[PDB]
Amino acid sequence: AMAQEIELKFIVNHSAVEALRDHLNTLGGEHHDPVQLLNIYYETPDNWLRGHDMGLRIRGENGRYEMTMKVAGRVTGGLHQRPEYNVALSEPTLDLAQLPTEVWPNGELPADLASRVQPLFSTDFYREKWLVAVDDSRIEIALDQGEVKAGEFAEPICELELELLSGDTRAVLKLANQLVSQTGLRQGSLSKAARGYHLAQGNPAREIKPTTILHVAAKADVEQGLEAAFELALAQWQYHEELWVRGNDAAKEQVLAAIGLVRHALMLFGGIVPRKASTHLRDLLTQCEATIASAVSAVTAVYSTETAMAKLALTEWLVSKAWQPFLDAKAQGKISDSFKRFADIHLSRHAAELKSVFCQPLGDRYHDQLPRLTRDIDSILLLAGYYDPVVAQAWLENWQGLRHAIATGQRIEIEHFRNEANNQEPFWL
Ligand SMILES: [Mg+2]
Ligand SMILES: [Mg+2]
């Protein structure tokens, strides 16, 4: 089969590198001085490997070569969990026959793959390492500094990785908790390969991604729905934070919206997961929101300890499934039942709230209802996924139009969408 890589990635603010290196040196690990890693990644003209979330490189460490294939896995905040397979090489030339068949989607290497792959991008960086023990786990800390480059287009590498060599993922999260007491770290959801692929397309500006309806598997239980909901909210926070720190000022609003979605998900599942399961998480989210609101700089806001601690708290809560020990028998029964059936009930609950609030025109008092309206839209986004996507998104579009118009003060559009929303019927059972 494949091996399994588990590592937590933090992007490091450039000014914080020296202070980080000093801190890492107080942990009492086995330290290795920087070594240059030279990598070339390979890809076809039709972006075949990228289409499968899989990356192929040859790594050089002082004339010693290694071929590595990573395949589709999971990214949760900064935590990358990818299957991989590494093969030692005698010289820098690919040998695709050495990889197991389970690497390939069809169980067979495409006939022309070796012939049509070209060098698409490189990563050239110096890696400094600390090996540390946390409980019964062993973790390799890597500090990477250099470049990722696709022809003309390059961007800096300045990041920290905590790779689990053996043991438990909880140990990685424990280690992270010590490090985010100081500024200069943010969880990074983009692999070096993902950034390399983007540069190779001419490094176009990334666009804001509005949240769309969550689609959870048929037969999923409520717990699976909950996991998918929090995965989505964290992914939307990560994506928009990356855009914001890269210079998109409009993305700030979407960072706050994603944090709002976390809160609304906690409320949605609050009949099952008690409020006390998320006391500390919600406290940290409040301080993060305040820091974001008052920030003069995206860089300062994003690399702050308020943001760092709040984000790590959410990642840990999700990955550790921290709700589980709080569930009594009744709650366990409800969380193990159908998400589809749960969703039908809660769609009606949120529709009742929307109808009662917006059945009449509200004059100068629309803006005070924004939090309620936003909660209900967010809740329906998480719940509406078992129906026809065209019908369901069309239903939501009218409430979303109302929310936009209220937020920007468009009097005509407020009344238009309020009427459209009150004239449409429900789509659910
Ligand atoms: Mg890595
Ligand atoms: Mg690694």
Author numbering: 0 to 428
Give verbatim excerpts from the published study on this entry.
Members of the ancient triphosphate tunnel metalloenzyme family can be found in all kingdoms of life. Our comparative analysis defines that most of these enzymes share a common catalytic mechanism in their tunnel centers, yet they have evolved different substrate recognition modes on their tunnel entries.
YgiF shares ∼18% sequence identity with AtTTM3 and has the same catalytic activity and substrate specificity. We next solved structures of ygiF in complex with PPPi and in the presence of either MgCl2 or MnCl2. The second Mg2+/Mn2+ ion is coordinated by three glutamate residues from the acidic patch in ygiF (Glu-4ygiF, Glu-6ygiF, Glu-162ygiF) and by a water molecule that is positioned close to a terminal phosphate of the tripolyphosphate substrate (position 2). Taken together, our experiments define two consistent Mg2+/Mn2+ coordination centers in plant and bacterial TTM tripolyphosphatases.
